[PDB]
Symmetry: C5
Subunit: 217 residues, 5 copies
């Protein structure tokens, strides 16, 4: 078991060394630039429509927001570090995209630890669970066809020149939706949109989350 | 080339942010102008039991510092960059009649351009003093809130708007409240006692329930 | 030259904050007088099910430290500056009958003058203990709340007001509550807990539902 | 020998922390088993308008690390100590179906024992998804919530319970809700995407309006 | 005035000698146990929620303890007998309500008073929601509720508690509160658990109150 004990100690030293090599010894990645655009993949896992407030036209959602991207500055050779193929790290240690809901009515509440997973190909996976209030008229929610609301997500400060967005699919993952929610989901889609606004020449990109729902009976 | 671009940005940031480090803010001898513009998104609620109304808007702030200027050719034709608002000086623009601390809805990041201008656009939810009486009539109700520096007079920070028309192109079409008009107007207030003039931007909103 | 004003400002602040260790707070040997003045902006809410009332006001704080003074001639004739409240010592002025933590409505920035004078004016929303019984009568209701240091007795911190009249000139004219009177009065208190006198400023507000 | 008791404790912590390499968290090579146990104190509220229920409980977490071991003999027979949760690694245990961020009710301090085991017990108020339909009947309502690592799969973190019976010995005897049963059960599952198994502890509560 | 400058320099020298010169106190231990004195000053019962059985109290919680590592001879420091310091600069006890339902909200500055004998006084003002059935509050007999306070992580072998009296101080109780106080006591308690070997100490705050008439 001495050998086993030693192998454990070595794997610890190797993880600490990989983290030293990527961070502490190398620059904090400054973010994407026009010559060097970054694509961030987004996908939503809708867990619950908690509340629909017809007195203020706000609706509260809980969901997991999957964010994926990939950087060269986060790559490593797993054979240089004892076959370490990935690691968990505090979101504070790396750059993360400023993905923002554009029509929230209260600051998002974070429901999960701010830790991401980094893989040897340099891909990052960060999945914040969130409670969000957003502008939404729930009239029709007490009808067969229910209510329809939409909310757009995207970078706040990086245009389409610097950050692009994609989805893997336009279907929101509903396999974890709360079976006894006050509201049943009729459909939920997530769709990339590209936009040009009157002012600027930068194209603007978002993912539009559209939810159709009604009072469960 | 990727590493080169990345290197250029990091070199610029280094030159700017610590070589002659944190900017001490404006003074009478080195004053500054902040341009303000509002993009009104939603009147979320009106409480006539307390005379508070809740607004959601984007507040566009713009200013310019010589200490933020650079030549793009010296840094790989980098014309701009994004940085955390805590890495730079920011103006203390404040609503003068809020009743609750402002809630911030957008990342605290700004865009700096090679000519030394900064654009910082905090999205905000604000509760402020407002009597909604009449909001359910044809005339609607009218409320106003002033914005400006808390600690700097007009001798250190001037305020400006590009237009006195609030941007309503993003106003929530299914809001409980419709906008009849919204203006943003520079005001100057002088006082006999103190020789410094005080500057604000008055946001005036006229609004009504739907019909 | 604009450059040189900046260098001068940064150097003054480095001399005052770095080229000397901070002010340790007042002592019995070196007591401190703080002047307080209230600018009452709004009575927002009066909850008769809980006997709490919510106020919005500006609280003016003034004091003076020999350790903050300088000769304007050594520093390009800079006579004053703005600085973050965290850079200097600030008095721990506390509402004695609050029922919730004070909510801060203004930026935490103070103004320091070359004579050692500091002016700090936090805007605050406060819930405090108050029976609003009679608020819906001509006579109105009456409430009070004391402000003073939490940890310094009158031997270390003394309080003053410039007047006994709360500044009502910015009071919100469409508030649900009209102010009948508002006074601020220094009091010398003896508490059974402690052999040292404690000083407060007592804010008394008389108000009623509006006509 | 009390100054010596003190000096020994300081050395131990200095030895373990500000010296020896600290744990970088568990890996597929060096996995960690975390024991969870719940002490249910109160069901505060059941909201049938939103299907949320608020619980107050103590969450017992226990794990063991070689890098936290020591021989009490080298340290004045110190067998355990208390230290801030921020000095050591702690597991990211998370309710999978909360609807608000958890509110912590107890200080963030852990107990570490010479065998390298750590005991951390945060008291929490949790809102989670729960349909309380039937709570006003004899059969009562049943709700469940899963707890597990957010970012570590079963390959890095395994979970266990010491018992499948929730500790009810501190349940508030005058709660609006009576507990009919509460269990805590380890579960394993996979998702068609991934080969790594996922481990949680499922907290199942049956409760009804008290009579 | 040079005298004032000199006192200030002594106070700074003391604080630096006490802290940044002596490695922060690691907390009490089996061999170095500590006694914490607790007293409550009840200011208000703000709210009694009968739909959730939560009651909200506003009170000052007095805490006192003494450490050898904080003592000094005034004669070596310009006869300073005491000073005020941020509560972050020193160890403070982890005194906790055992049946709160919301995190405590702090109403006073986090600053304590240390005196040359090594003793410390820290008095945080707090609003607390805790588990309490206010049934009977609108009657002559009133309602009775209780809430324990004690260390969360130290047992009786490391932290003992004491009260100077078993009567809660009511002299600052708000005279126009919705609720009047029939009685309020604060009593040291020793408990043992089956889970654990060591005995546990708390102070039990019992309050009897009713709707004011
Ligand atoms: N000129 C402009 N106006 C507005 Cl009112 C918002 C906006 N932003 C945020 C922003 C923040 C800092 C610097 N540049 C841009 C981008 C945006 C906002 C909303 C939806 N899509 C993009 N840009
Ligand atoms: N003498 C004085 N009195 C007051 Cl009641 C406020 C004040 N202000 C705040 C203010 C308020 C409204 C509009 N513009 C500015 C300026 C200020 C703030 C902080 C420190 N010094 C001056 N200065
Ligand atoms: N002995 C003692 N007991 C109490 Cl119940 C409060 C107290 N205070 C706070 C106070 C001061 C004036 C008016 N209301 C409250 C002074 C103090 C002393 C030492 C540490 N912190 C506060 N000191
Ligand atoms: N074994 C154990 N289990 C529990 Cl359910 C709680 C606990 N306590 C003590 C305690 C004392 C009085 C009231 N509630 C809790 C807190 C604790 C925290 C961290 C390590 N050890 C004990 N210790
Ligand atoms: N692919 C993926 N997608 C989602 Cl929608 C969540 C997720 N989780 C969270 C989770 C949720 C429920 C039960 N166990 C774990 C794991 C995770 C979180 C952060 C980074 N990488 C993986 N991983
Ligand atoms: C019972 C036991 O194993 N303890 C031993 C004992 O020989 C020694 O005297 C003590 C320190 O006093 O610690 C060690
Ligand atoms: C350092 C200092 O100022 N201390 C003086 C000391 O000379 C004097 O003997 C004593 C009287 O009580 O205290 C005072």
């Amino acid at each position: 078991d001495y050998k086993d004990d030693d192998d454990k100690l070595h794997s610890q030293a190797n993880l600490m060394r990989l983290k030293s090599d990527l961070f502490n010894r190398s620059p904090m990645y400054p973010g994407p630039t026009k010559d060097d655009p970054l694509t961030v993949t987004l996908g939503f896992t809708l867990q619950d429509i908690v509340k629909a407030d017809s007195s203020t036209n706000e609706v509260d959602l809980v969901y997991y927001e999957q964010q994926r991207w990939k950087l060269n500055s986060l790559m490593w050779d797993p054979n240089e570090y004892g076959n370490i193929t990935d690691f968990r790290t505090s979101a504070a240690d790396i750059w993360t995209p400023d993905i923002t809901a554009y029509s929230s009515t209260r600051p998002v509440q974070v429901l999960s630890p701010q830790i991401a997973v980094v893989t040897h190909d340099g891909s990052v996976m960060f999945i914040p669970a969130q409670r969000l209030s957003f502008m939404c008229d729930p009239t029709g929610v007490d009808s067969e066809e229910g209510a329809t609301c939409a909310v757009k997500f995207g970078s706040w400060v990086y245009s389409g020149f610097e950050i692009d967005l994609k989805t893997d699919t336009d279907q929101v993952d509903l396999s974890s939706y709360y079976a006894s929610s006050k509201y049943e989901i009729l459909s939920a889609t997530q769709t990339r949109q590209v936009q040009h606004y009157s002012c600027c020449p930068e194209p603007y990109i978002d993912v539009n989350l559209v939810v159709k729902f009604r009072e469960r009976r």
